[PDB]
Design a protein around this nucleic acid. Structure first.
Ligand SMILES: [Mg+2]
Ligand SMILES: [Mg+2]
Ligand SMILES: [Mg+2]
Ligand SMILES: [Mg+2]
Lengths: 80, 90, 80
RNA sequence: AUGGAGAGUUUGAUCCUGGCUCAGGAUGAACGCUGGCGGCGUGCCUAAUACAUGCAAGUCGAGCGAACGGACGAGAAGCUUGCUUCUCUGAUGUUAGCGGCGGACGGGUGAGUAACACGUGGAUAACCUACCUAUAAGACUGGGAUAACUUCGGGAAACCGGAGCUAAUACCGGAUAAUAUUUUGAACCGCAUGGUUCAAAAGUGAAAGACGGUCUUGCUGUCACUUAUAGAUGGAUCCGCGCUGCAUUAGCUAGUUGGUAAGGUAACGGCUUACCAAGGCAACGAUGCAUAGCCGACCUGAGAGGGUGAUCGGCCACACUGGAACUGAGACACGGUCCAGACUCCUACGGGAGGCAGCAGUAGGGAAUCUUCCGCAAUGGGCGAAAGCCUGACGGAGCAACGCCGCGUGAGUGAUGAAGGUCUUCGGAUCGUAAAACUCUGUUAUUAGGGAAGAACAUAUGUGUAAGUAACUGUGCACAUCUUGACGGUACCUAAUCAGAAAGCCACGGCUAACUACGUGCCAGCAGCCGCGGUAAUACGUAGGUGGCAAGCGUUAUCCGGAAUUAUUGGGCGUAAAGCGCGCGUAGGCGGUUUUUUAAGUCUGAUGUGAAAGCCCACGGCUCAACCGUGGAGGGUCAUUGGAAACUGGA
């Protein structure tokens, strides 16, 4: 029933075995001056088969803790 | 233990109790589970009472046990009678 | 010191003695059963049954948690 | 539309720039002078310094044995037939002890913490949960101990040690029983891991009795018990976002980042350990240093914002400092255990006891913050079937103008402008309707009577009625009747007496409401800033008068405002402070015209949530108000979901 958060982002490093780090980009607004400013957050997600490669735009979903800092799992590779 | 009880409000020499569902260990006047009504024992020389029968019955069925005064209040409102009838003829 | 506190000290010591005796017994049985399963022995099934009996009786006495007993039983019976 | 004031000061004079200062609001305030009452609040902000003394956690005899007392009432006559013993029966009770539950709640404090700690919104197909409620199945058959108690021994004590005996709802073996665990077949489903349900085998896991009713060679009511399942409650973990200063802190990290295996935990996971690789974080500020409990809220401001985190509520953390586990559903446990350290006290020197950041109080520090009070009568909590017991939570008294609010210190007529103070042009002017005198009132005060609500109850007793039983007791419910108040004979009401007990503080040069006299003479002194004082000072001191407030009035400290003086709203850089000496250029920022498309930004609905209390609006109750309660309204940069496509972003 209840679904879990899903994010789409580019892969910025895959040197780890079966792990890819996904860079999700957002635009937070300055609380006083109101301007839109870029915000990048790197997500450590599980890559079981090493299918994802550095550069491709992938989709990840939140899971239970899988490692010290891995909390997400790769769902599909939207683009490459 | 879940319980339906009276939490004090008002002022010195002027109490006003609210009827609240609360864990027994929670403080009086502190954390509550859900409020169900009010009980003013100093109004018009006759204790004013308001209660939500649906919530009272739901919590009694779930397992909340009233205190002495709340039991009397529920009897006066007739909630105890309906609860007993429902339990017996379930 | 409070009277009930002193009573609790005494009862705590007694309960600790009993619990540690039983826990040591169950640990010994589990170790013996695991060794027997690792090196096939004609006594294997009887030892595993004794280990399971003591594990569950300890779990019911609350010396170990039910989930701990379940893990012990699972690993023991998968080995055997 | 509900909302926004300025003034002084740079000059011979001016406009501008610019800082400085003042008028406002607020406080857990302190101090000075003064001081009548009532209500509602508030009261160690410093030393998370050390603590004398009293108290702050017990309860259950309807789980258990034993002991105290021993009623009702058994026997001889001491001829004392009213006092006598042990040879009995032995009631209501009580208790040292085992056992159950509680003690992890309630209460205190904010030291630590820059962190998923807190707030908000989600997730757990990675979780645990005693007491409570409901349903299903059971609660069978045996056993050995040990407290208590008796006796000896050792110790100052704390407390131990040996021997003998005795129970249980204490402990243990066995039987039966799983959705629990393994294995083989399935079916359907989701978001990787997987989840759900159906079969067939193997291994294994429980329990208790107590008090009553009955037709009493046997069934049954209440409580208690075991297992399984749900619910409820409580707890745990993960994640998005938000949340503080410093770069005169630029590198940090080696269990570190990932993987495989194992162990471990309720639970996933480098949580831990072996092996393989070299990863991981960081200018979008890592690391380091400094500071800090977070929040609802609170103060201020027209708002945008700025400041704060008392009381009250939520969450977190801690309990002399540090480490550790045991018991337990729950703790690594404020008034529990062990060890180390520092510190108090007892000792027979061998050894022991302890931890107010619980409520009072003491010393100390400080400008500064309460009495070693009454009571469980109300609410709440622990145990018990219940009566009931415990509860410094809590409900209430005492102390403090510390704050807010309410009412007083008299009201009417009173020119006859009395006397007296002050000034004076010596006419008078003013204090002044002020006073006196007359008339009235009793808020308030004094005395005497009446005297609430807060009280629901629980329990007990009669009557019914629902489930189940063959029936009965009991169970729940409904209606009835006696009994329960510390505050306290307090509030409040009634009757009588007296204006009689009850006004002080600052200011009067401008800002800024209020001016004269005398004394002093760049002295004494004042001062927030400009300044005032050297002989005729509205600025010093006193006096009269006046102004602003009033049981308060001033001073000091701190925050916001005024300050557009960090300018998003809402400022600037030729000469007032401010364009790098100038290029080449990376990141970032921004970007020409049209069409199609997307829907991240943007806009518009629905749903959930943003606790209560608080601010605001309305209503209601205290004689009003403060205060209290009720219902609205608002508060997100929040989350899912449906719509729109001009603009920014992507194609
Ligand atoms: Mg601190
Ligand atoms: Mg404790
Ligand atoms: Mg210049
Ligand atoms: Mg130039």
């Amino acid at each position: 029933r209840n679904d879990r958060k899903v994010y789409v982002g580019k892969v910025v490093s895959d040197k780890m075995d079966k792990t890819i780090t996904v860079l999700v980009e957002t635009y937070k607004t300055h609380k006083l001056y109101g301007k839109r400013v870029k915000y990048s957050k790197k997500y450590k997600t599980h890559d079981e088969n090493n299918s994802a490669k550095l550069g491709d735009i992938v989709k990840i979903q939140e899971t239970r803790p899988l490692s010290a800092t891995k909390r997400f799992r790769l769902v599909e590779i939207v683009e490459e | 233990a879940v319980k339906i009880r009276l939490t004090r409000l008002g002022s010195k020499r002027n109490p006003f109790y609210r009827i609240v569902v609360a864990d027994a260990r929670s403080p009086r006047d502190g954390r509550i589970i859900e409020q169900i009504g009010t009980y003013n024992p100093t109004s018009a020389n006759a204790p004013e009472i308001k209660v939500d029968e649906a919530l009272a019955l739901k919590w009694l069925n779930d397992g909340a046990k009233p205190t002495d005064t709340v039991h009397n209040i529920l009897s006066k409102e007739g909630i105890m009678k309906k609860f007993d009838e429902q339990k017996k003829a379930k | 010191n409070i009277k009930s506190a002193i009573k609790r000290v005494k009862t705590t010591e007694k309960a600790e003695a009993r619990n540690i005796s039983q826990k040591s017994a169950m640990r010994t049985a589990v170790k013996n059963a695991k060794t027997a399963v690792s090196n096939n022995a004609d006594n294997k099934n009887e030892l595993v049954s004794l280990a399971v009996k003591l594990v569950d009786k300890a779990a019911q006495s609350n010396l170990i948690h039910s989930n701990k007993a379940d893990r012990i039983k699972s690993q023991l019976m998968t080995a055997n």
